[PDB]
Design a protein around this ligand. Structure first.
Ligand SMILES: O[C@H]1[C@H](O)[C@@H](O)[C@H](O)[C@@H](O)[C@H]1O
Length: 279
């Protein structure tokens, strides 16, 4: 089993000045992927009681969800890649981790402060395989605008993580370099045992050696949730299906590719468009 911990979000997507609402967040995209890939999946999240029915579809995709109490629901405005934290559910606290079970937990936050760094060592004691998304540690609200800032305590906390996920913009923020491979080498030197890096054309996994796989389909409206889908697929392949790291990398790319053909989370039919020849 895998547990995803993170805020759900009312996304306000603004396309050429047109507002369109989507009910998402990183945990939605990742949890649906792992569940549809056949791994028992749990989500620990927060939102208002009134908004719980917006996220009921997690359960229809096989995901067990703990909807913890919050007086607000996270809402992020995305302008088209500029995002703003309009409203914020309450952060996670230590006691929210009390029931943690299963082999794997992915720390999947939308904004720095959602998942206080103090929770990292606490959670480490409870789980065999612990991963986190850099978005939760570098994307910082500043008069709402989510700005990219270096994660000051990265060298303290990266040693706690079996896997660390970044995308291009995160990796550059952490390292000063837009060379993605080199940033992987730098982030490894900070304590990261395995780094999963997504970028426009594909995914790079680095554990001392590089493994790469390219995406083979895409759409503009399907690109949101790329990285969360890819992370969840990699965790499924590597942690639960016992694929080699090279094979899990190709698998993660393959699953992400088919999800990117449409808006919203992975769909079961997407999996039929993968060939086993790929990975
Ligand atoms: O990865 C994206 C990104 O964090 C967006 O800014 C957020 O609004 C979406 O919920 C998330 O899925």
């Amino acid at each position: 089993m895998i547990t995803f911990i993170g805020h759900v979000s009312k996304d306000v997507n603004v396309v050429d000045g047109k507002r369109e609402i989507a009910y998402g967040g990183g945990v939605v995209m990742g949890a649906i992927t792992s569940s549809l890939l056949g791994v028992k999946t749990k989500v620990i999240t927060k939102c208002t009681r009134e908004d719980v029915s917006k996220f009921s579809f997690l359960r229809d995709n096989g995901v067990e969800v703990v909807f913890l109490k919050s007086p607000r629901t996270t809402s992020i405005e995305n302008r088209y890649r500029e995002s703003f934290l309009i409203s914020a559910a309450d952060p996670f606290t230590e006691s929210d981790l009390a029931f943690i079970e299963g082999e794997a937990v992915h720390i999947n936050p939308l904004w720095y402060g959602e998942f206080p760094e103090d929770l990292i060592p606490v959670l480490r004691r409870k789980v065999m395989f612990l991963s986190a998304d850099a978005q939760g540690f570098v994307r910082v609200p500043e008069n709402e605008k989510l700005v990219y800032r270096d994660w000051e305590m990265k060298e303290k906390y990266l040693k706690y993580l079996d896997l660390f996920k970044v995308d291009s913009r995160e990796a550059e923020t952490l390292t000063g370099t837009n060379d993605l491979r080199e940033s992987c080498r730098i982030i490894r030197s900070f304590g990261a045992k395995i780094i999963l890096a997504t970028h426009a054309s594909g995914v790079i996994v680095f554990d001392g050696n590089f493994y790469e796989a390219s995406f083979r389909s895409w759409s503009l409206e399907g690109r949101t949730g790329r990285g969360d889908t890819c992370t969840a697929a990699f965790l499924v392949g590597f942690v639960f299906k016992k694929m080699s790291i090279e094979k899990a990398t190709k698998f993660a790319a393959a699953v992400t590719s088919v999800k990117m053909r449409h808006p919203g989370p992975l769909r079961r039919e997407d999996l039929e468009a993968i060939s086993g020849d790929q990975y």
